[PDB]
Design a protein around this ligand. Structure first.
Ligand SMILES: *[C@@H]1O[C@H](CO)[C@@H](O)[C@H](O)[C@H]1NC(C)=O
Ligand SMILES: OC[C@H]1O[C@H](O)[C@@H](O)[C@@H](O)[C@@H]1O
Ligand SMILES: *[C@H]1O[C@H](CO)[C@@H](O)[C@H](O)[C@@H]1O
Ligand SMILES: [Mg+2]
Length: 360
């Protein structure tokens, strides 16, 4: 029942165009150019991180995949999409690019967004669609409830996640709820509380057929599996995603949720990274493209290794005077200067390409 099995993952035209038009022209090394062409074809997720993407990007991606499939793709292509617009988004962050607020009709705005997405998915029932549900949402309920915006948002995040899990429970869809990463929920003291939270949400949503499990390391740089713990992970015993998931799954399964995982490895190629501290998530230096997306992970609990955050697209501006500035993007281990979040960051793309592992 692995949704990644028996299909090819669609490598979208937006990311392809960014590499061909923004990156390649500026690369002098012939070897780096050839590798950039290859990276352009690696299928990464696309994000519905703003309401305007629903009637644009989403429809365009599904339309393009249908056309490719109707022309004979074999195996058929499947879509990889991130749902990321909860109101009062990123409750514990220093800065957030979310557009809606709970105190200003955010629940009704989010329900309508989920409803329109559902309508579009129903209209593309011939396109297998894999979704990552809301990164940096429920992981905050495990450890960041001391932050007032997070304790104030908790019930809404729970209710709206349940709403999304049921409304997007469609026969051709597979959903993975975000579950932070080893350096967030993988610490031994956070494992069980996290397992209690995710298994209860699953149960409370009626164990929807489409809910396949959880996604980890989204937009982070952790290794899947390395023999030695990177210094900035100490003293966490679960220093990589394999350690985190091997400890987490049994607790989830005992509580009624035999969650299968997908793990982001888009920026996990070079280990250790250049991060000075594990919580430094913005445009981290000393990182490289990691294992390519695949359904053949060699691990019973992991449906696939994926590229969720498209390496080369910025995490946030380093301009300290900008409205959306997050201080994490101005730290010593964040590559600067950096453009606005989501915009092509060619200097970062080149870094990832040079540090790729395995190499392209
Ligand atoms: C979200 O976009 C939809 C169209 O996809 C539009 O009808 C709706 O008004 C938007 N929601 C808000 C709160 O602006
Ligand atoms: O695959 C062809 C492709 O390879 C790589 C780069 O050299 C590109 O400029 C070129 O378009
Ligand atoms: C292509 O050429 C230029 C000039 O030597 C370098 O800046 C680059 O690193 C690459 O070798
Ligand atoms: Mg083992």
């Amino acid at each position: 029942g692995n949704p990644f099995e028996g299909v090819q993952l669609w490598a979208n035209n937006y990311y392809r165009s960014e590499v061909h038009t923004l990156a390649i022209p500026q690369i002098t090394d012939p070897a780096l150019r050839a590798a950039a062409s290859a990276v352009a074809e690696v299928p990464s997720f696309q994000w519905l991180d703003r309401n305007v993407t629903v009637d644009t990007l989403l429809v365009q991606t599904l339309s393009e995949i249908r056309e490719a499939n109707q022309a004979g793709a074999n195996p058929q292509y499947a879509a990889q999409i991130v749902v990321y617009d909860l109101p009062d988004r990123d409750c514990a962050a220093a800065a957030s690019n979310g557009e809606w607020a709970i105190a200003n009709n955010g629940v009704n705005n989010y329900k309508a967004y989920i409803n329109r997405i559902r309508e579009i998915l129903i209209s593309f029932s011939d396109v297998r669609t894999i979704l990552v549900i809301e990164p940096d949402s429920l992981a905050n309920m495990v450890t960041n409830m001391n932050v007032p915006k997070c304790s104030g948002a908790a019930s809404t995040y729970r209710e709206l996640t349940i709403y999304a899990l049921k409304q997007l429970d469609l026969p051709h869809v597979a959903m993975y709820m975000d579950a932070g990463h080893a350096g967030w929920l993988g610490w031994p003291a956070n494992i069980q509380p996290a397992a209690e939270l995710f298994a209860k949400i699953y149960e409370d949503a009626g164990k929807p057929r489409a809910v396949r499990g959880l996604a980890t390391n989204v937009a982070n740089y952790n290794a899947w599996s390395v023999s030695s713990p990177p210094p900035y992970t100490s003293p966490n015993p679960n220093y990589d995603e394999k350690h985190y998931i091997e400890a987490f799954r049994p607790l989830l399964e005992a509580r009624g949720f035999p969650a299968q995982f997908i793990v982001d490895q888009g920026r996990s190629g070079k280990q250790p990274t250049g991060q000075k501290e594990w919580g430094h998530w913005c445009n981290a230096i000393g990182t490289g493209f990691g294992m390519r997306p695949t359904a053949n992970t060699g691990h019973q609990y992991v449906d696939a290794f994926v590229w969720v955050k498209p390496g080369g697209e910025c995490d946030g501006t380093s301009d300290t005077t900008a409205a959306r500035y997050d201080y994490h993007c101005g730290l010593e281990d964040a590559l600067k200067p950096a453009p606005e979040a989501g915009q092509w960051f060619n200097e970062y793309f080149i870094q990832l390409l040079r540090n790729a592992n395995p190499p392209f």
